[PDB]
Design a protein around this nucleic acid. Structure first.
Lengths: 98, 91
DNA sequence: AAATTTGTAGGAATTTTCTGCAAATTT
DNA sequence: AAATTTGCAGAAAATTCCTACAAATTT
């Protein structure tokens, strides 16, 4: 009765294919494509912060959404993110989301 | 100004960048919509796993398997990098 | 009025980083 | 032959979690 949903198809993005068909593709692929374009627009400059870069680029919307979902409730949000409430405040403050 | 973008196409077949953060936002909106008050429990690890894997994969490709360069580029410790690679069975 | 959340902080638990070196690999 | 990387591990540093409670807010 239940068809398998693979971990990569849990967070997906609408894409358009060669037959103008709208299909869900993994978020993984978005991250992959962004990184491929990032490397391509690098031209040998030195990087030392790529993890923090990506992490910010991904943490901000996550906090935005879980806060919208919990209607400002940091405790449910923390419980739902699977992180400590203090950690959540830290992150929120880090991104000016207070 | 935006370093991490993806390519989008509109109805006129014009291609345009958009921040990765928009993708993440869309994916989460779809996620929250799809579940009806079912409990979400470990969402941070979820997303973090969904994002760390293609990152490791791409930086390891870019550094041709060189963990030291990968780790330096990413700005984390070589041990941390190894740990993460083990975590996702990329070793 | 009662239940929940919020702000806060000291301490414990865990994770990351630092240092350093023998062995293996790449150059 | 030399330089770099790898694998590893004990310790320091940093981060996250736990605990607990008064104050504030929501139900």
């Amino acid at each position: 009765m239940f068809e398998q949903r693979v971990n990569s198809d849990v967070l997906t993005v609408s894409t358009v294919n060669s037959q103008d068909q709208v299909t869900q593709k993994p978020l993984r692929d978005s991250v992959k494509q962004a990184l491929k374009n990032y490397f391509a627009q690098l031209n040998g400059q030195d990087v030392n912060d790529l993890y923090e870069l990506v992490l910010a680029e991904v943490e901000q919307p996550l906090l935005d959404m879980v806060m919208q979902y919990t209607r400002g409730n940091q405790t449910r949000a923390a419980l739902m993110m699977g992180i400590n409430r203090g950690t959540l405040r830290k992150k929120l403050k880090k991104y000016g989301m207070n």
